Design a protein around this ligand. Structure first.
Ligand SMILES: Nc1ncnc2[nH]cnc12
Ligand SMILES: Nc1ncnc2[nH]cnc12
Ligand SMILES: [Ca+2]
Ligand SMILES: [Ca+2]
Lengths: 316, 317
């Protein structure tokens, strides 16, 4: 079993990913660390605690992270995508289980330091907790086995605005700290996730399936699917957080390009992710020179990724 | 019925090929060359444009010297490692006899466009400083210009200055943003298009051995240009960038275009980055791409048709 920490802002697709991860036998979830984005940090914590209870694992630690990005100030949350409660306006009763005392940043440092080179981090939200861990412990990057990042848009339009994807836009400074940290990183951008979809027909197949959480998953997805229809004009949902989970377990379902990634932190392109493939020899140094490259998902085997996700979502 | 054209340029090896092509094109009337920095300093660009008019047997064609620096200021660092110290591949030719006109490139653009409203097209082959100065000085310029075809930017593709930016836009980001948001009829030909259109070493030899009026001069300039492509891009030949934008003026049917708002990043690590909003996604709230008039971005190129048209003009006797 591969040790995994999920840093997340649940969040409808985050919730699908967490429930899938609990059902994946080759994965050991050692904790959930929460962040703002789809909902405020306190809402993300409440949802993560409820997911642990729903999965029949209320002992799995939930560590609450930063309430604000690194630059400071109250974050604007995607309630128009994930609902006011962050799980598609289901307004469910509060969990009985409680979060741990330590912050998400300290939890990340402690678990990674306890098992060096063995713990993988799946980052499903803004990268604030991961960047805080990197800044507080400068050896953190070298100790984490792998960091799989759902975020960015590589030579494709963003979802916040043309320039930026939501997780990166939520904390550009944190994202730039993570991408330049020297850790073994895999980045799954919008250029990849828009290729992997669950149509309305696929969602009905889930509702009618024998899946353990099929009814709950279908109910959350109604609001999420509605946003895709209203904004993207797509009748179904894009699978973003479940695609990054697929990249943890089955990196062979993708092809990757190695290159230095930088994040724009100011101006009209705040939150923009840009990779240097290194195919052109630059005449002089630039912001991409001297950093360690990271792995950027370039292609995706769509039938293989869809098959793997459907199998986990519909497992009894 | 010849189409009036002003070429705003920083010659420049591919700029020079474009100007000589434009002079051989019968359906085109070049009413002037306006110069800017980039490949070489503005002075060098002017000297080269004057020499091109003389070489083409048209020394009466006006050359108007433009800005010596971008809108934000500062002496520009020039691409001498791409186009040579003289900007034309280190040929170091004698000075022209013809002299530039008295008026600046910005005033020339305003005057010619006001003289023939809706008839003058502008082909922009360098940083957009002169065009932006014309737009700022005269608020009717944008409506009176027939079309502005811009060689610049990189749309969902790496730049050539650095991963973020293409050279012409990076030379003056503020000017580029002024042009793209001006409301004029604009066509932008980015790096995403021009890297698809090439002349191999074999194609260059075919030009040297041709009956082209300027074949010997074009081949001589291209030696330095080709060596940069081999060193930097690893390509044995040259990309055709400025000649592709000229092809977009005369044969827009050799391309497909997407309409959308284009904004230019002016600060930070992404200074000079060009980004279009195709408008296919309904945004929840307003953003820097909201409320501007969309422009035309070249999306695909019929490579055999574009190469055939360029070769025809370069090899015309
Ligand atoms: N379209 C979108 N999808 C997901 N999260 C978002 N946050 C803001 N816009 C978003
Ligand atoms: N490859 C390139 N072509 C033109 N101008 C440049 N300036 C910097 N790199 C350049
Ligand atoms: Ca998420
Ligand atoms: Ca040029």
């Amino acid at each position: 079993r591969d040790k995994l920490i999920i840093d997340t802002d649940p969040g409808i697709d985050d919730s699908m990913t967490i429930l899938m991860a609990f059902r994946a036998p080759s994965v050991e979830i050692i904790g959930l660390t929460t962040i703002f984005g789809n909902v405020d940090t306190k809402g993300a914590t409440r949802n993560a605690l409820l997911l642990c209870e729903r999965a029949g694992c209320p002992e799995v630690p939930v560590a609450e992270g930063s309430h604000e990005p690194l630059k400071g100030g109250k974050p604007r949350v995607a309630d128009f995508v994930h609902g006011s409660d962050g799980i598609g306006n289901l307004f469910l009763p509060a969990p009985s289980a409680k979060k741990v005392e330590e912050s998400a940043a300290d939890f990340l440092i402690n678990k990674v330091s306890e098992f060096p080179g063995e713990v993988s981090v799946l980052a499903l939200g803004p990268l604030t907790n991961v960047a805080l861990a990197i800044k507080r412990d400068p050896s953190f990057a070298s100790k984490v086995k792998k960091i799989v990042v759902l975020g960015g848009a590589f030579f494709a339009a963003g979802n916040v605005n043309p320039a930026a994807e939501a997780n990166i836009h939520g904390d550009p400074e944190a994202a730039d700290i993570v991408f330049t940290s020297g850790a073994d990183i895999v980045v799954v951008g919008i250029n990849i996730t828009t290729q992997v979809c669950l149509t309305d027909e696929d969602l009905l197949e889930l509702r009618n399936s024998k899946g353990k959480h099929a009814a709950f998953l279908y109910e959350m997805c109604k609001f999420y699917r509605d946003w895709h229809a209203k904004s993207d004009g797509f009748h179904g949902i894009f699978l973003h957080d479940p695609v990054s989970f697929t990249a943890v377990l089955h990196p062979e379902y993708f092809t990757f390009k190695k290159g230095v990634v930088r994040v724009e932190t100011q101006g009209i392109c705040t939150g923009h992710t840009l990779m240097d493939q290194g195919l052109k020899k630059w005449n002089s140094e630039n912001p991409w020179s001297g950093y360690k490259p990271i792995s950027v998902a370039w292609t995706v085997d769509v039938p293989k990724v869809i098959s793997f996700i459907k199998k986990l979502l519909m497992a009894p």
